[PDB]
Design an enzyme around this catalytic site. Structure first.
Site, PDB file in Angstrom:
ATOM      1  CB  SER A 186       9.043  27.865  50.510  1.00  0.00           C
ATOM      2  OG  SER A 186       9.040  27.459  49.157  1.00  0.00           O
ATOM      3  CD  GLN A 244       9.729  25.265  41.507  1.00  0.00           C
ATOM      4  OE1 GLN A 244       9.761  24.239  42.203  1.00  0.00           O
ATOM      5  NE2 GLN A 244       9.199  26.405  41.942  1.00  0.00           N
ATOM      6  CE1 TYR A 302      13.901  29.425  49.214  1.00  0.00           C
ATOM      7  CE2 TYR A 302      12.605  29.811  47.245  1.00  0.00           C
ATOM      8  CZ  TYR A 302      12.697  29.386  48.558  1.00  0.00           C
ATOM      9  OH  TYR A 302      11.636  28.957  49.278  1.00  0.00           O
ATOM     10  CG  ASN A 306      11.529  24.350  45.650  1.00  0.00           C
ATOM     11  OD1 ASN A 306      11.646  24.781  46.793  1.00  0.00           O
ATOM     12  ND2 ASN A 306      10.472  24.623  44.888  1.00  0.00           N
ATOM     13  CB  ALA A 346       4.059  30.776  47.454  1.00  0.00           C
ATOM     14  CG  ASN A 404       1.507  32.855  45.613  1.00  0.00           C
ATOM     15  OD1 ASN A 404       2.131  33.556  46.402  1.00  0.00           O
ATOM     16  ND2 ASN A 404       2.086  32.241  44.596  1.00  0.00           N
TER      17      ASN A 404
END
Length: 360
Positions: free
Chosen positions: A63, A119, A149, A151, A317, A342
């Site tokens: 990220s 996601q 937050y 993606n 990560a 990670n």
């Protein structure tokens, strides 16, 4: 004015125990001190081949990729191609569902569209799958009220922001960000000649690289070396030294303060706090129990121009890698930590803060 041997001593006292405690196979660190980089490497890029980490080892940024996406978006604003107030539908007129009516590029870039999920689903393979996903999405919150937050949020921002250019996201990134900054070892797609430099990631005894996925390039798909990432930090600390005027402006816009949540401000990709910072806020705030939670936002009007007295940072990560970047523009002080495991964000942030604290 710390000697190189003092930087060396601070870094080895903090990073050596971190690598032992977290069982990190390989790590690269850059400390930026009075605007100059100092590099440190530990361990293996490829354990099975006993290939050590070097300054040319490529790591998955995960990220931290979002900081490139935010600056590319800034450059598109400075070119006059997009405005953050523009509705997403201006750039994707097939998004006809009513819930998209007041969702803007700003909302997508800053995770404030109203609960787009963390996601993109693994079942999304095509353009038509991606449209169906966004058309069927039901917001939990009105636009511009909660930060979650995601993606699926900043990924769509990156994909739409480049539409006026006529370029793919990858081409826009290469031509407008990587090339002007001479990031010649930074890739969305690692070319064959560079595979020898690409570290393996490690997860529960498996050697892994990140898998293709929808909007990956925009959210978690960049690979870079410790040298290019030190250049990335220097460039984001000193935009006025960049000859490409829209890229200088884009860097400044990505550190503008658009929203406040608690003590943090949301930029484009970058997140910011006032310096000096309470390290408890950034260390505890990086734990997924806070970092992945929905939190109320207030708009900042006008958005505050980039504050040089800021802690500017981003974690990242993938399944096999863990990255962190933090810097303080006013002090020309920064750090990049790239690892091929990670490991928990709080450990990264605490180590970074201990090193920069020591050098202030």
């Amino acid at each position: 004015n710390a000697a190189p041997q003092q930087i060396n001593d601070i870094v080895h006292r903090t990073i050596t125990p971190l690598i032992e405690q977290q069982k990190i196979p390989g790590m690269a660190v850059a400390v930026i001190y009075q605007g100059k980089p100092y590099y440190f490497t530990w361990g293996y890029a490829d354990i099975a081949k006993k290939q050590p980490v070097t300054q040319q080892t490529l790591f998955e940024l995960g990220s931290v990729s979002k900081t490139f996406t935010g600056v590319l978006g800034g450059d598109a604003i400075a070119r006059g191609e997009i405005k953050l107030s523009d509705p997403a539908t201006k750039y994707w007129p097939e998004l006809t569902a009513k819930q998209w009516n007041g969702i803007t590029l700003l909302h997508l870039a800053t995770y404030t569209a109203g609960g787009l999920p963390l996601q993109v689903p693994d079942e999304v393979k095509s353009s038509s799958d991606l449209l169906r996903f966004y058309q069927n999405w039901q917001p939990a919150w009105a636009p511009g009220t909660q930060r979650l937050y995601a993606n699926s949020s900043i990924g769509l921002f990156g994909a739409l922001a480049v539409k006026p250019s006529g370029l793919s996201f990858e081409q826009a990134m290469q031509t407008r960000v990587f090339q002007p900054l001479k990031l010649n070892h930074t890739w969305i797609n690692v070319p064959p000649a560079e595979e020898k430099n690409y570290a393996w990631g490690y997860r529960e005894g498996k050697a892994v690289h990140v898998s293709p996925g929808a909007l990956d390039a925009e959210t978690y798909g960049v690979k870079s070396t410790i040298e290019d990432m030190a250049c990335w930090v220097r460039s984001n600390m000193n935009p006025r030294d960049i000859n490409d005027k829209t890229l200088q402006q884009g860097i400044q816009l990505a550190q503008s303060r658009y929203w406040q949540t608690g003590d943090m401000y949301q930029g484009l990709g970058w997140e910011m706090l006032d310096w000096p910072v309470n390290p408890d806020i950034i260390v505890n705030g990086s734990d997924n129990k806070i970092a992945l939670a929905a939190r109320p936002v207030k708009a900042i009007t006008p958005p505050t121009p980039a504050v040089r007295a800021s802690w500017v940072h981003k974690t990242g990560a993938t399944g096999g890698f863990g990255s962190y970047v933090a810097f303080i523009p006013e002090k020309e002080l920064g750090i990049v930590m790239l690892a091929n495991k990670n490991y928990p964000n709080p450990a990264r942030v605490a180590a970074a803060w201990q090193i920069l604290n020591a050098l202030q």
